[PDB]
Design an enzyme around this catalytic site. Sequence first.
Site, PDB file in Angstrom:
ATOM      1  N   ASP A  21       0.801  -1.222   0.000  1.00 50.32           N
ATOM      2  CA  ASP A  21       0.000   0.000   0.000  1.00 50.32           C
ATOM      3  C   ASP A  21       0.838   1.277   0.000  1.00 50.32           C
ATOM      4  O   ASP A  21       1.290   1.725   1.038  1.00 50.32           O
ATOM      5  CB  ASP A  21      -0.943   0.008   1.214  1.00 50.32           C
TER       6      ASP A  21
ATOM      7  N   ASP B  10      -1.165   5.489  -5.769  1.00 48.58           N
ATOM      8  CA  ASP B  10      -1.668   4.627  -4.696  1.00 48.58           C
ATOM      9  C   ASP B  10      -1.931   3.175  -5.123  1.00 48.58           C
ATOM     10  O   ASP B  10      -2.984   2.869  -5.700  1.00 48.58           O
ATOM     11  CB  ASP B  10      -2.937   5.246  -4.084  1.00 48.58           C
TER      12      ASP B  10
END
EC number: 3.4.23.46
Length: 397
Positions: free
Chosen positions: A37, A227
Amino acid sequence: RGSFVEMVDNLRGKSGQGYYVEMTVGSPPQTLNILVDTGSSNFAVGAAPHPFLHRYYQRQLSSTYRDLRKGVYVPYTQGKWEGELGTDLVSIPHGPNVTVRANIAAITESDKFFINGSNWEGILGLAYAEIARPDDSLEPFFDSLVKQTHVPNLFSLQLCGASEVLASVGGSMIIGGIDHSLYTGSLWYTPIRREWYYEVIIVRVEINGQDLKMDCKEYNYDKSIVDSGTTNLRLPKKVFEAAVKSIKAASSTEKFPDGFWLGEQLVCWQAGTTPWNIFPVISLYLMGEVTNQSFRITILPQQYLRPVEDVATSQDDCYKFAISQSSTGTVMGAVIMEGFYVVFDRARKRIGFAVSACHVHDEFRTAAVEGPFVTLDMEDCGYNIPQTDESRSHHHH
Ligand SMILES: NC1=N[C@@]2(CO1)c1cc(-c3cncc(Cl)c3)ccc1O[C@@H]1COCC[C@H]12
Ligand code: NI
């Protein structure tokens, strides 16, 4: 270097449920699958029984575990996790040949965090300390890795996209370098605007070569980030509406339900007949390292229309529209990243993009990375987030 064979193909996952890497925690090593992440900054692992976990971090089984005697509470938009902070020895079996002592949040309670069938048991936040919880004094994993070893301060991600189960996905996280086999053509760099999220600046957006012609601050309202922990390309409300209108107009030969454009309904064609050529390319121009320069990354419908194999319509190829509205700025998620080899060059405060050797395309169009584009007297396209008294009161010693 130039080759990192041992780290190639070290990512796995299920379509739409994130990419994970194998990691070990504790002595002797306990293997867990960990969500990669770049949109968060904590290393946190399931550390208690949960309906969706087959296994979890067993602190009592680790001779090297140390309790930090401090809890952490992490609510976010779609869920919540909480737990106990500690340290232990961590390695990445298909990463660098090193072992580091890192902060680990032992997740003891959560809501809507774990996903049934995703096969991951924790999260590796690769973003900066500024957005770590409880605060920026909790050193993120990558910071610890760099400080404790000779691993260069850089990682790169190649995310490769795709009846009873979701489609398997794969990819590579190369830690400490750039693997030239993972891309073709030029590698272009955009500055990291600020080290918190991996924040970048978009200077222009085109849909099938047509400029959206918005004040460029609108593209970065209130930020634009890269992201790996988001599936979709998410766009600020105004930008989303303009993009949808343009994509609708280009694909107007087909009349899809409103549910489709909302990402709430699949649309299907008979196997292998998907009319890719009615859907436009989308180009995001990113600020270059040189003032007045930009380069564009261009994605295809093969990136923004996500394959979903439904049981009832298994004879057909069915797709989800994976561009969605945001109120927290642009999010360049897997929809963008699956087109490209993406270099998170922390050492040089920049993000690199090159055409991915594994991206999905056809014989007519390819995902592209192209530049330079020069603009005389380029405007500042960055948005300045209003300063709250909360934020302002913080002392940064
Ligand atoms: N960056 C990002 N990280 C977030 C939200 O955005 C996230 C995403 C997913 C997740 C679930 N399904 C698919 C994907 Cl790609 C990711 C699962 C857990 C998850 O928890 C993170 C907790 O920290 C805040 C940001 C959260
Ligand atoms: Ni002070």
